[PDB]
């Protein structure tokens with residue numbers, strides 16, 4: 001993998017820094033690296049593809065070296081360099097696609113393509129160059145069993161889940177208490193509702209709790225917490241838990257009371273925020289526990305008192321909501337986030353070449369399932385494919 | 398770590414091979430290794446302990462080498478060697494204890510004791526010797542990110558859990574259908590029960606399922622599957638779900654019907670055994686799925702018929718069961734088994750020296766809590782402490 | 795083992811250290827056992843120094 005990254009990095013440097021007119025002192029070392037790459041790859045044959053509809057392509061390497069006796073490189077130098085750069089870029093492209101379209105239950109970290117298996121040979125190690133990218137850095141670190149860190153802009157950490165729990169209910173569904181929630185990507189949006197507005201509850205307070213366990217431990221995360229759940233604040237007709245009927249939800253929003261958002265790590269409370277909103281920091285956590293309360297307003301103007309009667313018919317249903325967004329975070333494992341395009345590239349290649357579903361990844365690289373069941377083998381294969389996808393994106397759009 | 402293991406190994410080989418009357422050729426190479434250790438260690442000061450009630454001790458090395466000339470070693474030689482070996486054994490014992498009593502949330506795999514941090518220095522690499530123990534081999538393989546493996550006899554993989562689930566219930570608790578299970582160590586005993594004996598069930602069959610997700614993937618596991626749970630075959634008075642009252646359970650055991658045991662990895666049925674008891678093999682799995690049925694006998698003699706009426710009074714309750722033991726298995730992560738004494742050693746040292754509860758392990762190294770939340774940090778720290786404990790056990794009985 | 799060293803200075807230093815009494819037994823045995831490697835098939839030679 002390091003050799004593949006180095007081939008891509010040297011090709012990118014060659015395509016950026018070998019431009020007509022530039023002093024040769026600007027590309028001396030780069031040309032040394034390029035000539036070593038050519039010498040090592042020369043006299044080798046590689047075969048790529050043959051999985052799904054990915055074409056079977058053969059790569060024979062026989063290129064002359066780049067010149068060294070020149071002060072300011074000219075059009076001839078650029079042309080002779082670019083002719084080789086095109087072939088090497090195409091070879092790297094196909095090697096990366098071959099690697100991405102493969103998976104293995106056992107040894108998902110080990111190279112899968114036979115081209116990458118070849119490149120793993122010690123003869124090619126001379127092309128290693130500099131592993132400065134984040135993904136290659138983390139690849140080396142996890143090879144050495146060192147701490148890994150990936151920074152994400154709103155990481156996709158919560159498996160998609162739109163659901164509701166009914167702590168109190170009956171067939172008529174006209175007196176319901178419970179919670180609704182939507183977890184998706186980086187946003188939790190929860191809303192506890194009570195049709196009776198806590199008329200008959202002790203202290204006229206109804207408690208709601210929501211526990212969201214992450215599959216991975218996030219660190220140094222900035223989180224925006226807001227006191228309303230705009231998604232569960234409009235009239236709804238929701239089909240029952242068993243799909244037999246449908247029930248009506250006509251909410252009226254009250255402020256959540258005694259809000260407590262605590263971030264826990266293996267059951268221990270690492271961070272906790274009491275009735276605080278805005279930007280907050282979770283230093284190290286793997287579970288989020290949001291507790292809030294519907295407190296029946298002690299004092300009401302008539303226009304409010306009309307809304308909450310003592311008897312059964314509850315036309316309006318009291319609702320208190322929270323919204324939580326992980327804006328940025330750090331994770332030891334690989335994840336999908338808003339800014340990066342590695343998941344998109346891998347899925348695009350697999351879909352384009354119609355790769356049959358293997359044993360590890362779910363069909364179509366469904367991120368919801370992949371993150372719902374984030375097994376160690378899946379993590380290994382996902383890290384491998386994401387690293388090779390970043391390597392590829394270093395040269396191809 | 399490898400240096401500490403090598404010190405222990407060379408000291409064990411010195412206490413074994415350096416014996417009265419042995420040939421010089423039997424111990425020439427061992428004496429080379431011993432003198433290498435002495436020369437490397439001389440001139441160094443180590444400090445051990447200072448956590449909990451473990452005393453602070455200082456270690457100073459200025460020892461003479463061993464000069465082997467006698468054709469067969471005599472008593473003087475053995476006494477002189479034992480003088481050095483005893484001090485080195487004490488040093489290794491203290492270092493191992495001081496490393497076992499510590500832990501860290503971050504970088505839990507790296508040494509925590511200052512003595513071991515010092516031994517990690519480059520100059521002590523000259524003592525490495527040979528890493529032949531299972532735990533040290535797996536340590537090196539994991540450090541290089543190779544597929545490790547630990548072989549366990551009766552692995553303690555299931556957190557203790559004795560519970561029941563009533564799919565049908567009422568306040569009287571006189572007509573119940575559901576399941577009862579004990580997961581403990583390497584054993585799963587499950588029993589589905591029905592008071593009506595599926596008289597009103599569709600097809601006179603009641604389905605029962607028991608899903609147990611393991612916290613780690615087990616490979617090449619030998620399993621014993623027997624068709625009755627003896628633990629839930631006698632009368633019981635069990636507390637209610639909420640503890641309000643107690644309910645009486647008076648089982649009569651029928652054979653389980655349509656038994657299917659599925660071992661799954663990543664949601665795929667890796668192994669599936671249908672109505673097969675005795676010794677089976679699960680090659681690779683992370684969750685077990687027991688499925689069985691209570692089938693009302695289609696033909697009954699008068700004595701059996703008297704037990705299963707159609708009216709409410711159900712004096713005898715039909716029950717089917719399954720027992721599943723993992724006699725042996727292989728796991729990539731460190732576990733506690735019924736043969737190794739590493740968990741016992743670590744817990745014993747911590748208890749004896751009254752080490753305060755740290756940030757990673759649960760109080761008292763409670764195995765149930767540890768395996769219930771076997772986080773990656775806990776796994777790193779546990780592998781470290783187990784490896785150093787096995788190093789210690791080479792010299793301490 | 796009919797070994798060779800890379801320079802006359804190296805040979806003299808090895809002789810001195812081999813003869814001196816303060817040398818480690820490991821160093822003496824290594825100076826006695828150390829060998830070169832001449833691979834004509836690959837046109838390469840490694841010599842201790």
Ligand SMILES: [Zn+2]
Pocket residue numbers: 550735
């Ligand atoms: Zn046994």
